[PDB]
Amino acid sequence: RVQSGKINCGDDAGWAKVPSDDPGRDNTRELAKNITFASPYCRPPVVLLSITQLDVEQSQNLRVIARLYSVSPTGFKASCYTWHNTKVYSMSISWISIEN
Amino acid sequence: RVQSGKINCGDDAGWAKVPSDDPGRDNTRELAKNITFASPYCRPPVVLLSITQLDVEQSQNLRVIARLYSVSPTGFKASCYTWHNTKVYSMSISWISIEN
Amino acid sequence: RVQSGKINCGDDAGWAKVPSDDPGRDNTRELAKNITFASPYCRPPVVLLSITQLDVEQSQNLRVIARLYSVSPTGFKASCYTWHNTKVYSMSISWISIEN
Amino acid sequence: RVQSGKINCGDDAGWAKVPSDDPGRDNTRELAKNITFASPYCRPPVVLLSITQLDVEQSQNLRVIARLYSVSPTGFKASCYTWHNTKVYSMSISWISIEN
Amino acid sequence: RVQSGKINCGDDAGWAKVPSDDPGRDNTRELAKNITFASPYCRPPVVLLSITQLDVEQSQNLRVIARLYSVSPTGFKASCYTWHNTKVYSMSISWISIEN
Amino acid sequence: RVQSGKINCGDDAGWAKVPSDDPGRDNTRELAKNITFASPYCRPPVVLLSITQLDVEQSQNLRVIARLYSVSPTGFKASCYTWHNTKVYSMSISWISIEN
């Protein structure tokens, strides 16, 4: 079974401030999302994330991650993640899931 | 059946101006492509797009999309998509296709 | 069989200078990596690369590739690839592999 | 996609006399059936036949075939086949179908 | 996931008498077995039964079934089934299971 | 990958006498065959045997096996197997093979 989707994170004004887990990064923000598979798997599927949209301010550095936290049989937690003085106007992450 | 490929869009001087479908975007351009599968599927495969190359002018904002329009059993329409005063010297999109 | 992973290339000070294979590019650098599949395939799997992290200096152009050189049944060679006066502080490439 | 089923041919009084295609066999009879897959394939599936029931007269020889004539993407023609003075009171053929 | 196996029912002296569920059959006996998959499925697999061994008394009729009662994700109930004055010295049933 | 086939053993006059491996059986004969897959597997496929043809003398007992000896990635050894005073005029074994 193979399922796909898209996560439009949008502007980072709507993102939440989260506490840094990398000592070299501060002001870490993130639009986290809990995606739920249409047809649940039984064993957690292999998931790939892909950044398919980007709108980032040119005066400051491009700092972006498409972070994949975890994958259960039922869904997964992933996020658009930026930090420092980066400004993200728009970030979308397409994803895919395959059983095994 | 799993098939893969790469779409080298190149410079955006060669891209076509297309009419905006987002009210907040103007001067929308796009290198659209109609990809045809080597071995045709019968049911449309799940397709994932991935931006694997980028060459973008630093003086203006990074505005890029890897837009996936549609997927038939026989192929798919996707594009490199930029807008406003963004300059893209180079954009390649790797893709993958899986039956179900 | 489906396998996944992540290649953290990091800062490009640690990358090697490699000779250009594109006449229009100079000062080409690259963090090449030889990934080996946990469970070896017998026929080379289809592999997709995806840039899931980016930290790039804003004063100079964003020049990055997620280059996929080759794929054997046993593994694959891929790299984070930049050139000219681009500065990459961070680049991670998530990948996926599927038999056929 | 994998589909299964069962073909209860029953008594051979209800079977049709068909013309022999083997010179050494006469009085060839056969309960032919045209099975149609619930979910049609696109490429013809590999089909296996299996005799899972038998009720045959002991005074004469056991002559039975589970003959698989053809396989389209949409279904298949198979039959319970006996000949000479064999008497079949009952013959069921379970089958399986797999894409490829 | 595909799993296989074999059910040696042996002599029908060791089989249990079970009550007939077909009005035209009496003295119905059966060696029922509850098979459990090594690697459990999550959705019940499609199962095919196949009689791969037979030792039957020639003075009386060949009456045998390879009956497939049910299939759960975890296993299945099947049996060697005979009736009337048939004598089975030996009956083995090979089986196969496939997810979907 | 799924492959199928048929093994027509024919008359048991052409079968070889082989030494018994069951103490209760004598005069054991067998038409052994070494089948080779058209498209070789890499891991040995799961193989199911099925008797789809039978022509057996009624005056003596039906003693038949569809014996599956071994399965390599490249093929398999199986046989039509009878013993004692059983006479087999005809025995065909259909088979199927699936990767995993």
Ligand SMILES: *[C@@H]1O[C@H](CO)[C@@H](O)[C@H](O)[C@H]1NC(C)=O
């Ligand atoms: C989904 O995400 C939210 C937000 O972080 C979290 O609180 C919740 O526990 C997640 N769901 C699961 C399955 O844990």
Ligand SMILES: *[C@@H]1O[C@H](CO)[C@@H](O)[C@H](O)[C@H]1NC(C)=O
């Ligand atoms: C492929 O793309 C072109 C350009 O947009 C379009 O005109 C054509 O209709 C497309 N093909 C299909 C299958 O519609």
Ligand SMILES: *[C@@H]1O[C@H](CO)[C@@H](O)[C@H](O)[C@H]1NC(C)=O
């Ligand atoms: C893996 O990468 C290294 C570095 O480029 C290379 O020398 C080596 O030959 C590669 N391994 C294989 C399988 O060729």
Ligand SMILES: *[C@@H]1O[C@H](CO)[C@@H](O)[C@H](O)[C@H]1NC(C)=O
């Ligand atoms: C199905 O079987 C019948 C009976 O032999 C035959 O006439 C018919 O043509 C078959 N259908 C197809 C698909 O040809």
Ligand SMILES: *[C@@H]1O[C@H](CO)[C@@H](O)[C@H](O)[C@H]1NC(C)=O
């Ligand atoms: C397995 O078979 C036995 C014997 O008929 C039966 O009692 C038991 O309930 C079966 N197990 C399941 C899963 O029901």
Ligand SMILES: *[C@@H]1O[C@H](CO)[C@@H](O)[C@H](O)[C@H]1NC(C)=O
């Ligand atoms: C195939 O069968 C023959 C006859 O028994 C045997 O001699 C031969 O060794 C077999 N081939 C393999 C792969 O061992």
